[PDB]
Symmetry: C3
Subunit: 488 residues, 3 copies
Amino acid sequence: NSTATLCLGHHAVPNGTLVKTITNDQIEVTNATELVQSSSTGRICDSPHRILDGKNCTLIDALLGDPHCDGFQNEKWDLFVERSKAFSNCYPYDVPDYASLRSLVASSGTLEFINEGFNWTGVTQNGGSYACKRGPDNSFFSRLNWLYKSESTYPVLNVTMPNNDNFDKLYIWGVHHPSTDKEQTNLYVQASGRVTVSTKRSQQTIIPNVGSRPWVRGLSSGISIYWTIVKPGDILLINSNGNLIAPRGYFKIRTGKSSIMRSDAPIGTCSSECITPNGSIPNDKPFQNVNKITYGACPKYVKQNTLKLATGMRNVPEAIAGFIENGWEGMIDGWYGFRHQNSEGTGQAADLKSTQAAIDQINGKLNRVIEKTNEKFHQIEKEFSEVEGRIQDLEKYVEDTKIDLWSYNAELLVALENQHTIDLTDSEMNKLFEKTRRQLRENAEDMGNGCFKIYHKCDNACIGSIRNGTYDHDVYRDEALNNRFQIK
Amino acid sequence: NSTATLCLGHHAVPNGTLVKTITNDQIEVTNATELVQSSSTGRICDSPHRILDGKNCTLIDALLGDPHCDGFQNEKWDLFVERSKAFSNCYPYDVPDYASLRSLVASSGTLEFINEGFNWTGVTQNGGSYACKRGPDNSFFSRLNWLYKSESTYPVLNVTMPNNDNFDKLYIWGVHHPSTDKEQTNLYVQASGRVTVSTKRSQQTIIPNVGSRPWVRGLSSGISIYWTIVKPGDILLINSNGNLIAPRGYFKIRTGKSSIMRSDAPIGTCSSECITPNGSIPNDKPFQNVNKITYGACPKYVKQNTLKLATGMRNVPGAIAGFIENGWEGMIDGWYGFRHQNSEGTGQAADLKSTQAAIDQINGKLNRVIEKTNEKFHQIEKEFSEVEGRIQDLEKYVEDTKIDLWSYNAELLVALENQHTIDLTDSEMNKLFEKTRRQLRENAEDMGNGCFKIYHKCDNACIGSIRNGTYDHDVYRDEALNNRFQIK
Amino acid sequence: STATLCLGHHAVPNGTLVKTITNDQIEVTNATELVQSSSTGRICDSPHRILDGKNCTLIDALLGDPHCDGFQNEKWDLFVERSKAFSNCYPYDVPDYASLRSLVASSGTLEFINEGFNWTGVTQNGGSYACKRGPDNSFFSRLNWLYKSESTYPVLNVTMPNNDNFDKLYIWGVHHPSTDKEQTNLYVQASGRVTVSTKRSQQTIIPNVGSRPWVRGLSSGISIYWTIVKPGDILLINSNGNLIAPRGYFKIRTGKSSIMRSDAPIGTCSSECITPNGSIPNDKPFQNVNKITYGACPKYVKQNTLKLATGMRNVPEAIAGFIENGWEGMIDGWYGFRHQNSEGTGQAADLKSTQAAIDQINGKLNRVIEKTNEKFHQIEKEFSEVEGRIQDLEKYVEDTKIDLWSYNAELLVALENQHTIDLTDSEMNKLFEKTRRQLRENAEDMGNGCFKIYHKCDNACIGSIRNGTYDHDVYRDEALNNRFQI
Ligand SMILES: *[C@@H]1O[C@H](CO)[C@@H](O[C@@H]2O[C@H](CO)[C@@H](O[C@@H]3O[C@H](CO)[C@@H](O)[C@H](O)[C@@H]3O)[C@H](O)[C@H]2NC(C)=O)[C@H](O)[C@H]1NC(C)=O
Ligand SMILES: *[C@@H]1O[C@H](CO)[C@@H](O[C@@H]2O[C@H](CO)[C@@H](O[C@@H]3O[C@H](CO)[C@@H](O)[C@H](O)[C@@H]3O)[C@H](O)[C@H]2NC(C)=O)[C@H](O)[C@H]1NC(C)=O
Ligand SMILES: *[C@@H]1O[C@H](CO)[C@@H](O[C@@H]2O[C@H](CO)[C@@H](O[C@@H]3O[C@H](CO)[C@@H](O)[C@H](O)[C@@H]3O)[C@H](O)[C@H]2NC(C)=O)[C@H](O)[C@H]1NC(C)=O
Ligand SMILES: *[C@@H]1O[C@H](CO)[C@@H](O[C@@H]2O[C@H](CO)[C@@H](O)[C@H](O)[C@H]2NC(C)=O)[C@H](O)[C@H]1NC(C)=O
Ligand SMILES: *[C@@H]1O[C@H](CO)[C@@H](O[C@@H]2O[C@H](CO)[C@@H](O)[C@H](O)[C@H]2NC(C)=O)[C@H](O)[C@H]1NC(C)=O
Ligand SMILES: *[C@@H]1O[C@H](CO)[C@@H](O[C@@H]2O[C@H](CO)[C@@H](O)[C@H](O)[C@H]2NC(C)=O)[C@H](O)[C@H]1NC(C)=O
Ligand SMILES: *[C@@H]1O[C@H](CO)[C@@H](O[C@@H]2O[C@H](CO)[C@@H](O)[C@H](O)[C@H]2NC(C)=O)[C@H](O)[C@H]1NC(C)=O
Ligand SMILES: *[C@@H]1O[C@H](CO)[C@@H](O[C@@H]2O[C@H](CO)[C@@H](O)[C@H](O)[C@H]2NC(C)=O)[C@H](O)[C@H]1NC(C)=O
Ligand SMILES: *[C@@H]1O[C@H](CO)[C@@H](O[C@@H]2O[C@H](CO)[C@@H](O)[C@H](O)[C@H]2NC(C)=O)[C@H](O)[C@H]1NC(C)=O
Ligand SMILES: *[C@@H]1O[C@H](CO)[C@@H](O[C@@H]2O[C@H](CO)[C@@H](O)[C@H](O)[C@H]2NC(C)=O)[C@H](O)[C@H]1NC(C)=O
Ligand SMILES: *[C@@H]1O[C@H](CO)[C@@H](O)[C@H](O)[C@H]1NC(C)=O
Ligand SMILES: *[C@@H]1O[C@H](CO)[C@@H](O)[C@H](O)[C@H]1NC(C)=O
Ligand SMILES: *[C@@H]1O[C@H](CO)[C@@H](O)[C@H](O)[C@H]1NC(C)=O
Ligand SMILES: *[C@@H]1O[C@H](CO)[C@@H](O)[C@H](O)[C@H]1NC(C)=O
Ligand SMILES: *[C@@H]1O[C@H](CO)[C@@H](O)[C@H](O)[C@H]1NC(C)=O
Ligand SMILES: *[C@@H]1O[C@H](CO)[C@@H](O)[C@H](O)[C@H]1NC(C)=O
Ligand SMILES: *[C@@H]1O[C@H](CO)[C@@H](O)[C@H](O)[C@H]1NC(C)=O
């Protein structure tokens, strides 16, 4: 009646969330946000990157020019999408070091092809086969030139092509392995051929083998595919006395953001910076557990399927009492505030400055975390369909190492950040209590439960002056000292 | 007129330990625990992983079937242990890309071998040599079939074997390099042979060289070993006109947790999840400095030989004084407590709740740290006995990079955790002081040394009620104010 | 009569912005750069042995191109290859050049030991006008161009045992003649074969006539191969033509040597860390100059600046204490006292709280500013040729590493700066509370970081509070009489 109670408190919610800290595996906070992206729509968005659907064609088949890949001539991409239904339907072939050729073409991002006029005087050009029909006609890989005998002879070819440009030229060429000695001599006269392709820096010599290829699509013969990159100022030199599958010119090599991905996901009309084989994913979260294979501005792949970042204080659900006892579920207009009991009854008011200070700090850490860009393009392969040994062991170990270090960083980051969020929101509460304590000077005592006993009549305007920071302790000091320091 | 003193304090020990924090290179705490495992028993425990001691056999010699390795036929392992004393005692051989074959067989974890009936019409099978005695008889690698001439001729072999199964088949085969032209024609009739082994995806064509092998165990000849993996739906094609060392069938390729390790540690009867070349090591600690080569559920390798995690507070060794001055070596039944001086003498009591609060938080961190799992199986090689250039530079760099990043994580983690342990144990002391301060209301004053002057007569039951949280300050307030506020 | 005692901390007019866990930009009184971002542009010739390749690549110095003769038997910690280097001997190519360059660079020596191979039956020391040594047709000094003798070139079978306890590096080659006429004039056989074997390995190369493009007058060339022979093993050479034989071996060593491509001049100075841009200081833990380095180097990161706070929050400025703002006129300490009393007014630093904060910051600086990180031969990180799988993996490994270190550096600075701000705020509060507890009932907290002291409190009395010897009992009667009026 001669006194009043002023309690300091913080909000609480009925539906709290559990997060991890440095200290505690599970502490309940008022709010949290997920840092691991774990779902995809399942479709590859066709913006903002240039997506090229390979459909029935591998990139290598589009490169060589298998007839059902003719629509890919001179195509370009940011991301070539290779489908598991793709098939070859041209002359049987193999590519030693297939993976490297696929990778370097994928990274170049273009099949831009420039015809060159090689001087093939002495041999016949444009061989074709019923194994490689283009429409109804016997035909061949569009970018390769199948040379064979002319006028019953096949001379030693010595043919050059200088690179007088300022970019690297990619030449694709091949070696034919006939099924029989009869086919060998019918096509090339010599009983054994030889293909040598040279630059000033390199030499690739292949001796064909008769009868070495298994039966594929009607033929027990095949071509082996090789490649040569000619730098500016260098020269392509081709020397052969049989079995040469010649280039018709070069692919222009570019550098940039292009890559390739294996995926059976449909392409859709939508926009997304991050692509995975499962489909595009949002990149607002810093981490993701959808696929270690990605392209674009992507969250970092981690092993965790959920990491919860606290975005609110500890949740401590509900005469009056202050924050030492529990939080206040009825406070919805701020995070911290005041409840009082005085000659006008009880009331409650949020404290706006302490609430914003806590919110500002939390939004700051959110903006540090919700900010990362991490755009990556052509990388290494991360899934393999063949058993290979040493190099594949190293590719897998590098990726496994990377994911374990990022998963550790993610785990530690959330635990540290959450500990710090709990600490800074506790700290805002204590600061408001101490600020109030020092306004009241000798006119109040701390009751030990987050409340002050104010030793003077302290109606609603007077409480308001405390909340407002304008309380004048000298106006009330005589009344309060007289009430506090009696000995009755 | 009399008064009393109540001091709040924390324990101290006479034998502290030094730890690192963010701030301090060496601060003494009451207790700490080692996070780096730095010893091994020196024995490889034979549980829980299936250990296969190679004894005198390398994995490759067991694979090919050198006679003194006959006992390894169809063996399996989680970890094959290769001994430095191993030796070859059969036909001299070399393996181009030995490391990859060793890796992929080790990773497959089995020598399960399935005989197939290749059609060798036209040649003689089962060649043997006195360099490869099996019992008293000239013999040969058990898994290889040495073909040579029949009825004075060696025809062009064209032999196939389809993979109609749903797993990969591993074929091991070889090429014979005779010492002389006489040996060449005596065995194979043709003056130069050729071994071609093909699938739809690949071709390995080897031209044998007469006289190219150095003298080894009585022979200036040798075989070179190659391998071919045939995927389901593919086919093995073997084409040869001499010098073929044929497969007798295939090894079944598996995927799983198997690997291989080089070690001379003895195998013992015991149980340990983590295996290193030095022997098994315990994995209760998160880090280890024993060997970067490990197998199983292992601590992470780091460069440090010791990292001490604080598990107790800072150690700070006629009247009593509180925590401001130093810790209390005589408090042995709790971490925090009370000392008093009153009209009944001097006394001491531990505070159980604040002690548990500190202990529970520390145990929280310990379980977060001491819970590391980290199970790894087949990895990359990390020690090398040959000089190799580019690929080995990359293998070493990847591992060096990994170890430096984990060593950094381990150092930072321990420094942060220790700072936090010191802060949280300091915080519990302060909270207990402030709780006591607010219980006492106007009846005591803080003397500034961690003690309260209690301004009233305050016998043992009264002290107990403060420690117990049942002190009623109104009972004593008139007495205390009268003693506090005199003007004499 | 009363006094006022304010507790406060310093401030500066020229503060610096740093990042914390909470804040992208908070101003502190002082900070230090953790990223090295400049170089002088010269490679210091101490303390590492630098060998300037000048006009010579390492491989040309290894083979022994005549204008590289001065490099015979040289050694290095770091071989510096210059972009102006050129070849001027017989045209050659090296399959897997990069690996040979790497293992020689890492070995750190061109020490060559001549051995007496038995070439009876062929002629030794073939030479060419494309490879002049002085006025004479010559050849690579370390290679032996063998050709026919007495109209024949027999099947050579030549061995050289390694009876030593180190590995021997053998460099050898295969000649590709321009024409069949050249092939048979030199080697009689219309097609040669070079086989080089150990117990562990076999390298068989078939030469090809006419396969090399025209270079410096010749449509001919040699291809270079290498073989390492371990102790107890043997080199075996078998050839019936086109063999470019070794003259002996290079001794392989292990140690800290490497190679670097750079056009930076070599200077007389001392620096532990070398980059292609020049040497850099290694006092900072991070650097943004070049991911290629050699020696005791800061770790490469993507950021071009990371500022580590080395002082408290900067809060620029009767008297008032730290609740209101910092004190720009306090230049002798970080924390201190301002008073108003019967003798006037003054300001004094508190040395103990200042030193306590400074010691903690110097502690974290020592953890940061100490790292050594000495690295020597690593992987290549820039590439002049398009290659596919292995180069993709080399690039990815390095990109992965740099992103992980850049993250560690960003987090370290944000965490440390938060902690520096927290610990310097904490020293301020601790000094206020210490003063509060000295004053007992003789003062009240005015709420602005100051105490009203309710008694006469002259300079010696203020000094006793600063010193921790204030005796509250001496003044308590006077103070209680002034506080508790009605
Ligand atoms: C070397 O041996 C292999 C295995 O015997 C031979 O491959 C076989 O070649 C025949 C035709 O030359 C293939 O027959 C074809 O079968 C298809 C469908 O089965 C049929 O439509 C065709 O009309 C034709 O009859 C057979 O499939 C193929 N087998 C395998 C396993 O590849 C190869 O031709 C031999 N090469 C020689 C002797 O030069
Ligand atoms: C090519 O030349 C090398 C030597 O330049 C020949 O190697 C030598 O071969 C003979 C056998 O013909 C080996 O003789 C053996 O020596 C041991 C003693 O260690 C003895 O116990 C045996 O009874 C036998 O006499 C000799 O050791 C070996 N030398 C080396 C250095 O390996 C090689 O055989 C020649 N190859 C051809 C195809 O001609
Ligand atoms: C295979 O064909 C190539 C392409 O023509 C031949 O290369 C050419 O060879 C001639 C000499 O045989 C070179 O002529 C020289 O040109 C320089 C001009 O820089 C001149 O100064 C010399 O006096 C001489 O005339 C020509 O440069 C060269 N062309 C190229 C593009 O390299 C090659 O010789 C043929 N190989 C065989 C074995 O026939
Ligand atoms: C709980 O926390 C989240 C994260 O801070 C809050 O969500 C943000 O809300 C603002 C305004 O509505 C949006 O502009 C942001 O985009 C949201 N961020 C995220 C990461 O979702 C949410 O408002 C908080 N409060 C609750 C749920 O009561
Ligand atoms: C995204 O795709 C990956 C790869 O196809 C999915 O991972 C496979 O999941 C199945 C069943 O969950 C497992 O049997 C395979 O072992 C997984 N493969 C790999 C390579 O990890 C993943 O589940 C997909 N995620 C989403 C969200 O669609
Ligand atoms: C475990 O074995 C490793 C490898 O043998 C030991 O490391 C070697 O130690 C010797 C002498 O201490 C050195 O000369 C070698 O250079 C070290 N080799 C490598 C690869 O590091 C290691 O000391 C052993 N540890 C334990 C606990 O037994
Ligand atoms: C700002 O902070 C830097 C870092 O502590 C101070 O520079 C140090 O000063 C001492 C004494 O002069 C030197 O011995 C150290 O080598 C310096 N360290 C570095 C990293 O430069 C500098 O003195 C501080 N400035 C002010 C005005 O206090
Ligand atoms: C690198 O090579 C060039 C070309 O051989 C050298 O420059 C020549 O130097 C000689 C003697 O000093 C002169 O007679 C020539 O006229 C120069 N030619 C040219 C084109 O400049 C140069 O000296 C060599 N540099 C080093 C460091 O050895
Ligand atoms: C080095 O090689 C030559 C050539 O093969 C060896 O010369 C033969 O030596 C034997 C006797 O030692 C003679 O009967 C042959 O007539 C020799 N051939 C010729 C043409 O000289 C010579 O022995 C070998 N040298 C060494 C030191 O082993
Ligand atoms: C050190 O040298 C590197 C490499 O030459 C410089 O990096 C190049 O910088 C220019 C402009 O910044 C770019 O166009 C190139 O793409 C950069 N190359 C690479 C490989 O990054 C770097 O700027 C130099 N640093 C210093 C401090 O001199
Ligand atoms: C709690 O419920 C509110 C109101 O429905 C909702 O907006 C909020 O996101 C929920 N918070 C948590 C942490 O579940
Ligand atoms: C792919 O090939 C199959 C079989 O030729 C055909 O039915 C289908 O139309 C093709 N798809 C595309 C996109 O061309
Ligand atoms: C092509 O080469 C032949 C030499 O075989 C030559 O005679 C002919 O003139 C060349 N043609 C052109 C267009 O240069
Ligand atoms: C010291 O710490 C270890 C690790 O937590 C613990 O097991 C041990 O009991 C502690 N010792 C004492 C005396 O408390
Ligand atoms: C100090 O000695 C006791 C012996 O009773 C031991 O139990 C305790 O762990 C030791 N303290 C530390 C920090 O090791
Ligand atoms: C290994 O070989 C030696 C020599 O043949 C033999 O004495 C020993 O018994 C062999 N060890 C095993 C385990 O077979
Ligand atoms: C093996 O092949 C020969 C080659 O003509 C053939 O005659 C023979 O019948 C085949 N043998 C079997 C068992 O099929």
